[PDB]
Structure 1
Amino acid sequence: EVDDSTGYLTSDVGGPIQDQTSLKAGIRGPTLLEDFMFRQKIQHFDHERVPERAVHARGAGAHGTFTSYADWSNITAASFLNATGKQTPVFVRFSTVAGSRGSADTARDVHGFATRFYTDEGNFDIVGNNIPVFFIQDAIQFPDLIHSVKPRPDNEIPQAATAHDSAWDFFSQQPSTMHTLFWAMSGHGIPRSYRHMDGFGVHTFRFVKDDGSSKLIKWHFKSRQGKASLVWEEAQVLSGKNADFHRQDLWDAIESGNGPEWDVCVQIVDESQAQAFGFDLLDPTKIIPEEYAPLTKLGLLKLDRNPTNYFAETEQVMFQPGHIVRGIDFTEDPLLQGRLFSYLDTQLNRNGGPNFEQLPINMPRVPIHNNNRDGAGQMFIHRNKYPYTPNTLNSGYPRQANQNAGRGFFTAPGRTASGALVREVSPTFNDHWSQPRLFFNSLTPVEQQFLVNAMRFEISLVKSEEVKKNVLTQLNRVSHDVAVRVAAAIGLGAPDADDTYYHNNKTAGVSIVGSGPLPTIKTLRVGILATTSESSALDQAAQLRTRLEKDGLVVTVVAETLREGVDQTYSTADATGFDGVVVVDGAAALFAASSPLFPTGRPLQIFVDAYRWGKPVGVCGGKSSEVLDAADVPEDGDGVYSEESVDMFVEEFEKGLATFRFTDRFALD
């Protein structure tokens, strides 16, 4: 860490200098080439930027700790997992997928959840998503998916969005994507925060024990903050009012001592069970339903420290599934296999040189011993002058590590191969439609509506008639109902039911709106709409504040202008900034009326928006009975709150915050 709280300005080589005026030939003359102060400064600036990540360019990171719950030697040799209470430092970056690095957090997308464990046996990375399955079955297709999903290559439109022709052209021609597509079209595509979503490794990996035996595994990071998501119409507005919403959220949660937590869990099954669930476990388009393999909680992951320099830490972190430790191994998942190549090659693009593992954030916490040398940006001075193997001149050091010596990584010895070298897809990968259906069946009826609606939204922006038809064809193969309802919005006939993959099987834990109330309401944001006219209004506010802040909520009092007790103005305020909204009684005048200090109708607009997006809304005070009829909000409606007793208003409101979304306000087909 470099401290600049005191001192005089120096060059990068420590010579004291100034940097405010160019060196000129006369007070009104031209600048001199010999002005090294100028050039060193501007050269640095000119070279500040590096290529953004090819995918997941938009994201944010934090420091934390992983703690093991036990000694898991019975399932894996992995050292970070070998003792009860063992603590490994971590760094996690969350991201969206398609958007470039300045795009909105709240676009609809799959989300990245990438975790580095800095273990005492090397760095170990789990590079996953908030959605447990992926669009494609072979890594070689990654550029096809990503090309089609990103902006059109002629005009680079649209940013951060699947709502254009090429994406759906791809989805409709590559049916493997149905499952992920359904996930992304649910609320999983627009989470309320990084803290309110899960992490998944997607691929099946292997646990390996010192005796060389292996089980097949799936990683799950389950959120202790619960599952929550935005509604589309709210996410759209948020993207404009606050492109930084998710990163501000994570930053804030950590600053206020509310670090988010996840249970790091696995599903464990036998090698013999590769095909025992009606699909191939090497297929990254499928989940093992919880019904057939329960989750084991391995340890606790907690984020509790924000970075100091975003660029140096978040932007430079370079994850790799290649960063593997003794106790884990890969599987023949053709998606996972290709990823191994990609993540090593891409960092050359991003770092511009081969020594990217030497950046502080990428360094391990244990010693390095190997014969890698040179390369641009070499930061080490190697003492071993015989960097070859086998040598006698350095006494045959460094020694080879393997199964039986030095705790070397080793491939699971059970793994075998047979047959021809082929560029052919396994027939066991061919069912693209069952699991999407399983997923859809497991959602509440409103969740289903929202999913249909997301699809209606996007498909209607697809210009090509032929592409829309092919979309309906694939959708129909998952559910005729879904096809029909989607087709209705784009004025086409859904094709005739095809029931080859229809079924009524459900699975638990994939639903957001059906996962019951949030386990905690700490850090949720409450907006209090007040005024500077009535002296009573601000007093009501101040009292709600004390009571709400006591329960860990984040309170904003809104008024026409700033002063003591007021956090922000109606001008800068918006419903998307709040999880619930409270109007204090004394502000009734404002909801019934114009001001040069905010746009017309703003105070009411905030409230009405909050209600229409399914949020806990309420009026607190005497004339509360009547402020609602003016606002056109039903007094008896679920999650609408009307009370005089401050203590009983809070108590009622806090129940609404836990329910989080009031689903009765949304029309069904």
Structure 2
Amino acid sequence: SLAPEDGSHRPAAEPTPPGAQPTAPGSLKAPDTRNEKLNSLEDVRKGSENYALTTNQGVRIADDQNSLRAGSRGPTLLEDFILREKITHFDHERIPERIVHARGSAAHGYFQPYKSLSDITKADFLSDPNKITPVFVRFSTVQGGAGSADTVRDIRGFATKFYTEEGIFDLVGNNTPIFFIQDAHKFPDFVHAVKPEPHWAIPQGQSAHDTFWDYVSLQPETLHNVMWAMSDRGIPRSYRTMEGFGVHTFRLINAEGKATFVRFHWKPLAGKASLVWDEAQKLTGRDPDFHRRELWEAIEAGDFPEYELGFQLIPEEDEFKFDFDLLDPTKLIPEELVPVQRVGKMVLNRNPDNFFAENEQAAFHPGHIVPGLDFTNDPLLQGRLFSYTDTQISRLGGPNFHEIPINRPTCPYHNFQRDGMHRMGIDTNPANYEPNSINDNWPRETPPGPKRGGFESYQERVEGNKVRERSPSFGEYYSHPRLFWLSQTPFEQRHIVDGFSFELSKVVRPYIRERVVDQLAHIDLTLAQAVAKNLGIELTDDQLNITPPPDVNGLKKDPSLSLYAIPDGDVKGRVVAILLNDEVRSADLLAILKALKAKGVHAKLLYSRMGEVTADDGTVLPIAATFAGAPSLTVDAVIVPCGNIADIADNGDANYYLMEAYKHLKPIALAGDARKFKATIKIADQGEEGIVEADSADGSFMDELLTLMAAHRVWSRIPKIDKIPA
């Protein structure tokens, strides 16, 4: 018995804030959170307590510390089958990572529609507001490998497996509403250009290198999604505070056979929020697992990620009514033109038990649709349909990947497919073909119908010759990048210019930087000039005179394209660092902590060492982390209570903690003598917007700080940080 007798090895099976208890497998942390998929995995969940250690053949092991040898200092013997099984298993633990989106973090949850959508789709999962569908969701980055960092600048994947009563539907989306390329034939080119360069395999997790920008400079279709990656959309605060999009136009099909075009959206109920670049890049070093950690810990705290599914619907008669083609995945549909209709809510409320078994082996594929949905001829979508089933034959070892437990449907599945590696199901049908008489033709085809019918494709007319040709309707590249640029606030535009400037500075061949800047000049002269200035490039008179692309259907901006132009702040589940001293003013800390708790904001108590400190009134304060152990990168705001401020006033880490938070536009609150830190961040005596300061943490101090938190960052500080040495 190695566990401590006090039971402190084991986390409480109740919701607890981040850092209060060790994390645990979801079924041990939240045993009473259930859904139909999580219950169906009970057949394969394996416990451990009170069981004997055995080989995989069920033979009990007596000595798991030693190989069998001839003499205690002698050679190891080949007949040691217990050693060889253990090491064989170990030796073959790894499977290939996903070719793209290899770095991802997943959780279980459930979806429910707000109302029946039977007028527009016969999909069973959207038929009844009382019908709950379990989901499994994986969020990801794109370029880096499974052991790369979370807070890179990249697009994010947002993939949802809906375990419906009429089959698995996978909605395999990203966090921007378009893609970089138009036709799937180019996907290996684009991905090879953004991935580490093939001679030396550098850089990981970064598009900031010559081959990415070479491709971009030569393929202007990429410029719209490059604009989104360069904006703060490319560095989200958390998977909870980003949007999701299916990108492509798909179809909904109703029981009368009417097709409606649809684009899928997820709205984050926590609001939209991103980091700033220097913070994101630094955080990839201080905590490369920051998003995976934040997701897991938000679920263990009960801060469940929630998202609203929404549809942009366009009738079939309106296919050609826009300046852009609905089938072009480099074009977005502005919400000012076509509103998102709210459809239902997804809640992710349980972490997996075993990351490899559930996250690593999960297989999502956008070809997994159900009756009531159909495809369109978007030429990127069309190639995706080939790839996601093909890639599993090597990644997951064969064609029985649907029998891996996480991928199994919860509804019935029966057919005449047999064998393959890893075959789990033992078919008892006398027939393995149809038509057959020997089993009366079962399992049988089902005609299409309003409910529980077979799948039939919408009978779209096709007319044309067999060609390898891009539609001329797709040959417009600059207007949507411009619409995005003009929709951002002034600080978002500054961050876009700084993103392109930093990335192009890492491109070693200067002519590629010049070719990118020339593309920028086809989008917006202000953007191109500001990027060119940071690169020491002067635009030519010809570039200064390029006429801007046309507005999109008359729009010169759409505020739903900005992260921050329309406030949607939510403080619940955010975290504040509290910088302690060795005799904290306990009344300040009571007021601070209870105000945060009331709004669901978490706290981490920091000091210059671990263990405890004692407040003025004798209260014993446990320390969560040190100033360097839990840097300001990992929090949303910083509060310094009064007390013996001389204890930390000359601590370089305490001072730097405030400088780094200040640089990264975070709210900072200073009570009492903690106001002596104003000199460190060069605040004037009469104060400044974004710094909360008072004699004590009472009265309006916490309300002011929480108001700042709801607005996320102090954008007005940007010209001030510009010269702080941090």
TM-score, normalised with respect to structure 1: 0.96
* 1:590 CA displacement: 4.8
Give the match for residue 665 of structure 1.
717
* 1:70 CA displacement: 1.1
SS in structure 1 of the partner of residue 584 of structure 2: helix
Change (3 A) 1:249 1:199: same
- Whichever residue aligns with residue 112 of structure 1, its letter is G
CA separation in 2, counterparts of 1:571 and 1:395? Answer: 71
Change (3 A) 1:463 1:310: same
SS in structure 2 of the partner of residue 498 of structure 1: coil
Give the match for residue 189 of structure 1.
234
Query: Which structure 2 residues correspond to residues 22-41 of structure 1 after superposition, within 5 A?
Result: 22-41=67-86
| Alignment equivalent of 1:541, drawn from 589, 592, 598 | 589
CA-to-aligned-CA distance 1:175-224 (integer Å, 9 cap, x gap): 11110000010110000000000110000000001221100000000111
* 1:517 CA displacement: 4.7
Answer yes or no: is 1:552 the counterpart of 2:600.
yes
SS in structure 1 of the partner of residue 134 of structure 2: strand
Change (3 A) 1:630 1:197: closer
* 1:404 CA displacement: 4.5
Contact 1:541 1:557 in 2 (8 A): no
TM-score, normalised with respect to structure 2: 0.89
SS in structure 2 of the partner of residue 179 of structure 1: helix
- Whichever residue aligns with residue 628 of structure 2, its letter is S
Give the match for residue 618 of structure 1.
669
Contact 2:193 2:211 in 1 (8 A): yes
CA separation in 2, counterparts of 1:526 and 1:303? Answer: 24
CA separation in 2, counterparts of 1:462 and 1:616? Answer: 35
Give the match for residue 407 of structure 1.
453
Give the match for residue 15 of structure 2.
none
Change (3 A) 1:281 1:539: same
Query: Which structure 2 residues correspond to residues 493-642 of structure 1 after superposition, within 5 A?
Result: 493-494=538-539, 495-501=543-549, 503=551, 505-518=556-569, 520-532=570-582, 535-537=583-585, 540-541=588-589, 543-561=591-609, 562-563=611-612, 564-590=621-647, 592-593=649-650, 601-621=652-672, 623-634=673-684, 636-642=687-693
SS in structure 2 of the partner of residue 219 of structure 1: strand
Give the match for residue 597 of structure 1.
none
Deviates more, 1:556-565 or 1:39-48: 556-565
Contact 1:56 1:98 in 2 (8 A): yes
Contact 1:530 1:538 in 2 (8 A): no
Query: Which structure 2 residues correspond to residues 136-147 of structure 1 after superposition, within 5 A?
Result: 136-147=181-192
Contact 2:584 2:641 in 1 (8 A): no
CA separation in 1, counterparts of 2:484 and 2:536? Answer: 26
Contact 1:616 1:657 in 2 (8 A): yes
* 1:627 CA displacement: 3.2
SS in structure 1 of the partner of residue 495 of structure 2: helix
- Count, aligned residues: 658
CA separation in 2, counterparts of 1:516 and 1:475? Answer: 29
Contact 1:528 1:556 in 2 (8 A): yes
SS in structure 1 of the partner of residue 227 of structure 2: helix
CA separation in 2, counterparts of 1:223 and 1:402? Answer: 38
CA-to-aligned-CA distance 1:208-252 (integer Å, 9 cap, x gap): 012211000000001110000000011111110000111111111
CA separation in 1, counterparts of 2:222 and 2:338? Answer: 24
Contact 2:179 2:247 in 1 (8 A): yes
Give the match for residue 33 of structure 2.
none
Give the match for residue 89 of structure 2.
44
- Whichever residue aligns with residue 455 of structure 2, its letter is F
| Alignment equivalent of 2:60, drawn from 16, 21, 46 | 16
Contact 1:592 1:630 in 2 (8 A): no
* 1:403 CA displacement: 2.0
CA separation in 2, counterparts of 1:497 and 1:260? Answer: 48
* 1:354 CA displacement: 1.3
Gaps of 5+ in 1: 595-600
- Whichever residue aligns with residue 654 of structure 2, its letter is P
* 1:588 CA displacement: 2.9
| Alignment equivalent of 1:329, drawn from 346, 365, 374 | 374
* 1:542 CA displacement: 5.0
Query: Which structure 2 residues correspond to residues 115-514 of structure 1 after superposition, within 5 A?
Result: 115-404=160-449, 407-413=453-459, 415-494=460-539, 495-501=543-549, 503=551, 505-514=556-565
- Whichever residue aligns with residue 50 of structure 2, its letter is T
CA separation in 2, counterparts of 1:200 and 1:587? Answer: 51
SS in structure 1 of the partner of residue 154 of structure 2: coil
- Whichever residue aligns with residue 257 of structure 2, its letter is G
- Whichever residue aligns with residue 505 of structure 1, its letter is K
CA separation in 1, counterparts of 2:473 and 2:298? Answer: 44
Contact 1:106 1:190 in 2 (8 A): yes
CA-to-aligned-CA distance 1:512-558 (integer Å, 9 cap, x gap): 1223150x2111110011122xx235664355223322321110111
CA separation in 1, counterparts of 2:238 and 2:717? Answer: 23
Question: Equivalent pairs: percent with the same residue?
Answer: 45
Contact 1:530 1:541 in 2 (8 A): no
Give the match for residue 598 of structure 1.
none
* 1:393 CA displacement: 1.0
CA-to-aligned-CA distance 1:120-146 (integer Å, 9 cap, x gap): 001000000000100000011011011
Change (3 A) 1:416 1:32: same
Contact 1:611 1:633 in 2 (8 A): no
Contact 1:124 1:324 in 2 (8 A): yes
Deviates more, 1:221-230 or 1:3-12: 3-12
Give the match for residue 13 of structure 2.
none
Give the match for residue 67 of structure 1.
112
CA separation in 2, counterparts of 1:131 and 1:296? Answer: 18
CA separation in 2, counterparts of 1:626 and 1:20? Answer: 58
CA separation in 2, counterparts of 1:203 and 1:302? Answer: 24
* 1:491 CA displacement: 1.3
CA-to-aligned-CA distance 1:424-451 (integer Å, 9 cap, x gap): 0000001111001000100001100010
Contact 1:222 1:262 in 2 (8 A): yes
SS in structure 1 of the partner of residue 383 of structure 2: helix
Change (3 A) 1:587 1:266: farther
Contact 1:530 1:587 in 2 (8 A): no
Task: Output the aligned Cα RMSD.
Answer: 1.6
- Whichever residue aligns with residue 484 of structure 1, its letter is Q
Gaps of 5+ in 2: 1-44, 613-620
Contact 1:591 1:631 in 2 (8 A): no
SS in structure 1 of the partner of residue 83 of structure 2: helix
SS in structure 2 of the partner of residue 95 of structure 1: strand
* 1:19 CA displacement: 2.2
- Whichever residue aligns with residue 531 of structure 1, its letter is N
* 1:154 CA displacement: 0.6
| Alignment equivalent of 1:646, drawn from 689, 692, 697 | 697
Deviates more, 1:119-128 or 1:209-218: 209-218
SS in structure 2 of the partner of residue 210 of structure 1: coil
SS in structure 1 of the partner of residue 278 of structure 2: helix
Contact 2:328 2:474 in 1 (8 A): yes
Contact 2:107 2:138 in 1 (8 A): yes
* 1:39 CA displacement: 0.6
